[PDB]
Each structure stands twice: as C-alpha cells, then as structure tokens.
C-alpha cells in the first residue's frame, strides 16, 4: 500500500540486474534509498546479488552506503556473506562501515569468515574490521570459522587477534607472551600466505619494542633466523616489516645486537641500502645504526660487513632523512657520535 510503483520499479531492476532500466528509472527521479516495508534498499539487493555494475551506479547517484534493513544489515553485511569482492570493496571505498553490527552483533568480518570468503576477510581486516568482535551471544569471526570448518579464515584470523593485542597495553603483551603465542607466531614467518606473515611480523615487531624484556622473549622463541631469511623477499610490504622487527630487537642490549649479528642480518642490510624504495633503505640503515650502538665487538662487525663505504655514499642521497641517518650512523661507528639514539617501530 505504502510506497510508489517508481520506487517499487527501481528496487525490481536492481534486484534482476537491469542496469540500463536502473539507470533510466533513476534519470526519472526514482528514490535511490527507495525502501520497502523491511527497509531493504535497491543497494541491499544490487549486493545480495552480485550486480557490481548496479551497486556503482546506485552510489554515484546519493544511494545511502550504510543503510540498514529491519534486522540491522547493510549492504556490506549482505555483499560479504554472499563473497562478492569487488562489491564489497567498492562499498567500503565508498565510506560503508566496517565494524556495522546487526540487531544480534554480527558485523560484516562474522559473515565472511563462517562462509569462508578469504580474500574479503582480509579486505575487512585491511580496512579496520574488529578481528575480535563478539556477536550477542559471544561468538567472534574465528568461532564461527572454526565451527564452519574453515580453517585459513580461522588462523588468519587468530593472527589479527594476536596482531591486536600486541598493538595493546603491556598486560596484554605479557598475556600473549604467557599463552604462549610466540611459538605460533614465529612458526608463521615460513608460511607461504603472506596475509600470514604481514600478521606474524606485525605482532612480533611490535612486541619486540615494549623492553629488552619482551625483546628477548622474542629472541628466545627464534625469531631471529625467520626474519633475517625473510629479507630476500620479493614482496617491499614484507620487507619493510621485518627490517621494523630486527630494529627494533637491535634497540636492544649488546648481547640483544650480537643475536641479530649472529643471525646473519649485516650481510643482508648492507645489500639493502641499494634498495630504491627509500622506505626499505631508511629501515636497514636504522637497524645498522642500532647495531652500531652497541659495544666495539658490534660496531667492529658493521665495519667487517662494508657498511662504511655505502654508508659514506649515502651522504649524497637525494632523500635528506637518509642523509642524516648515514651521517649518524658514521659518527657512531667512527667518532662518539652516538646521540643520534635508538630507533624505534612502535
């Protein structure tokens, strides 16, 4: 009774995937949030059923990204569970909610995981999805993995909880720590899937710049050996990562320093100042000048590895960062100039 056949025209094409009739409709006034009696949107049915086209034309013109049907979903939940991709990107490239929960808490990362949608899962989690949220009766998106027997979504997921709370406070660190997550952890610098190890060498890298402490929990779980390896990686992200990790183990005390030396680290960062990416370069020049902090059997060993003469040669570097970060290194390895401080990914 309520509502006009315009609107009830439009909700019809977007749902049957007419997008020439979409479009005249719309030219024609049709409401683009035009809802039913359930508060379902042309959006919410171009998502439930997979019109990529549709859902772009819906949001160029005004179509509302988070609007909520009856029972709490939005298009996001309805475009995850289904495991259309590129809708659910060009959804959340469009300002929908990440983290929207339903009349029983369930957001959107809850209805990937159980249905086994990797790729989105890590698309949610990339966008700022709580790998931890809890729906009303408890179940987080790694329960409902778990209870559907998909077990990538469910590691992946595990590794964003320990991701998470490794970024936290220091109880929650040492309750990582206590749980025994390094061994996981560590075990995932070999894996393959490198949603994995950008998981693994997030956590890992930000335990180890909480104290020497937690560094050498993370020294004695054998971190050191997976990440020296893991920069020959082709992949920058990973590279950068790791090279994070070892600085801030090398931010350490000098038997923390001789670990990472021990490890083989000096003949891979010293190749690394050649990188192009001015990112990865910085990051090994600052792992060396960490290492070079320490005691003369440290900094003799930097010397041993030829990092004085790249590091002479970055003092003509374009990138000015890189220019101070040689010359400081320099100073500390040949004239007490050592002010130039530990550095430090937190």
Do not use: C
């Amino acid at each position: 009774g309520p509502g006009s056949d315009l609107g009830k025209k439009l909700l019809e094409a977007a749902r049957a995937g007419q997008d020439d009739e979409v479009r005249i409709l719309l030219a024609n006034g049709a409401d683009v949030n035009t809802a039913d009696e359930t508060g379902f949107t042309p959006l919410h049915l171009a998502a439930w059923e997979g019109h990529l086209g549709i859902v772009e034309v819906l949001l160029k013109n005004g179509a509302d990204v988070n609007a909520n049907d009856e029972r709490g979903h939005t298009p996001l939940h309805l475009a995850a569970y289904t495991g259309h991709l590129e809708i659910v990107e060009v959804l959340l490239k469009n300002g929908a909610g990440v983290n929207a929960t339903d009349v029983i808490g369930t957001a959107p990362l809850h209805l990937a995981a159980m249905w086994g949608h990797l790729e989105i899962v890590e698309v949610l989690l990339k966008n700022g999805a709580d790998a931890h949220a809890r729906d009303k009766f408890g179940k987080t998106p790694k329960d409902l993995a778990e209870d559907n027997g998909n077990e990538d979504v469910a590691r992946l997921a595990e590794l964003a909880e320990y991701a998470h709370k490794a970024s936290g406070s220091q109880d929650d660190i040492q309750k990582l720590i206590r749980d025994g997550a390094l061994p996981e952890l560590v075990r995932e610098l070999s894996s393959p899937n490198e949603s994995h190890l950008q998981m693994a060498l997030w956590a890992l890298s930000n335990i180890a710049s909480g104290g020497n402490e937690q560094i050498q929990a993370v020294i004695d779980a054998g971190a050191l050996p997976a990440l020296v390896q893991l920069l020959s990686s082709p992949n920058e992200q990973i590279l950068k990562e790791a090279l994070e990790a070892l600085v801030n183990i090398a931010s350490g005390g000098n038997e923390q320093i001789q670990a990472v030396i021990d490890a083989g680290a000096l003949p891979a960062l010293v190749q690394l100042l050649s990188s192009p990416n001015e990112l990865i370069l910085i990051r090994a020049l600052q792992a060396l000048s960490n290492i070079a902090s320490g005691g003369n059997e440290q900094k003799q060993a930097v010397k041993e590895a030829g990092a004085l003469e790249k590091l002479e040669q970055l003092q003509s570097h374009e990138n000015e960062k890189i220019q101070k970060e040689a010359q400081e290194a320099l100073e500390k390895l040949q004239s007490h100039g050592g002010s130039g401080g530990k550095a430090k990914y937190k």
